[PDB]
Amino acid sequence: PQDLSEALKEATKEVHTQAENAEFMRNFQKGQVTRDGFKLVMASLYHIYVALEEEIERNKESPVFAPVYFPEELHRKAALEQDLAFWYGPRWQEVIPYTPAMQRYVKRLHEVGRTEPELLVAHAYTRYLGDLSGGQVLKKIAQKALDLPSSGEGLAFFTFPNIASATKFKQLYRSRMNSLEMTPAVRQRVIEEAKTAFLLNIQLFEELQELLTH
Template sequence: MSIDLATRLREGTKHSHTAAENTAFMKCFLKGIVEWEPFRKLIADLYFVYRALEAEMRRHQNHPVVGPMYFPELEREANLAKDLAFYYGDNWQNEIEASPEGIKYVNRIQEVANTEPALLVAHAYVRYMGDLSGGQSLKNIARSALNLPADKGTGLHEFDQIPTVEARRAFKAKYRDALNSLPVDEALAQKIVDEANLAFQMNRNVVHELEPAVRAAVGEHVFDLITRQDKPGSTERAPGSTSVELVAAE
């Protein structure tokens, strides 16, 4: 009997999803508080993360579990490089470095790639489904807050081959079907869910490092007003609720 891995991942990461939405950085972001320096540092960290993830997905594209989840149209490295050229200039490769938590994130991706490649599926799921879902709203917030040119600075969330809401919805259905077709047993399915929760945690650790810069930019009082209260996560609310969903499978 096939395993509904897509639903397992969605249901099994609800609490991690809520925690991600309730980081101080994300609460500020959703209020339109996007500061240039922490934002470009985040883009730099994500460049290293996606570069590692995509190199390993390509390396294991003939793996029975990884291969069906390798979609070249999702790759973000080239777009992130364009973003970094915009934020740091032509010499961007010499201007950026991964943060300590970013390095841990990259190391984990490389570790599972070398020891249990099937777990790469969890990292791909968390990153790409977030980009295709709530990432589209985050893109608009960043554009407005930073007054970005129309074609600069948000390449992370630009999908040339999946450009419309309808196309993204259809692709996510295709992605769910691919997840549910994977040759995994109960034990491996649970390992993938556990790894997805770890991926959420590592992403939270990366943004936590950026919060002091946001606090300094907006001031203690405003920062505390925005961040003091947690809210239910979008995946835990009733249908019809409006919120930015970081990873969606609708």
């Protein structure tokens, strides 16, 4: 396509279906998710957003990222901190898991942010835009399966408080992505990096499924 935002969505549709088809996500969508499983997703997201937001901050003034720098609207670390205190309790920093598949994702995020910052947008796309389109329904499934007490915490990750409308913010984000100027080579690399991002998630999903089924 012309617009990078369209080119990304089109080019990742297949891997996106793979992610939807992953065994752990299938169980999820079918409402079969356990607290143990959900804890692992929350832990994974924490390590992922820590590293991504670290690298966004390192690159916030770079011409290859600045147009999609939206820290107040999108930042997820503090929400995940809140959520992990609930899921893992007061000592969550000492007890949350940090698995090999989580590390592999984090390592690629840091590699991209430090040495290939022009691809960071692929990672921010894969995560943030995903989160905006999807939080709604998967959250509801979670609440049903998990049957939380009404303790007012645990799911802050799924609310972006600084975005009034996800639809309008997603159009704005697409617009800014489409304003990035890149050579055809960089653009091919950005697309490929998004596929890589999806694969990192899929591999993580494969690992969590393994860890939970012994």
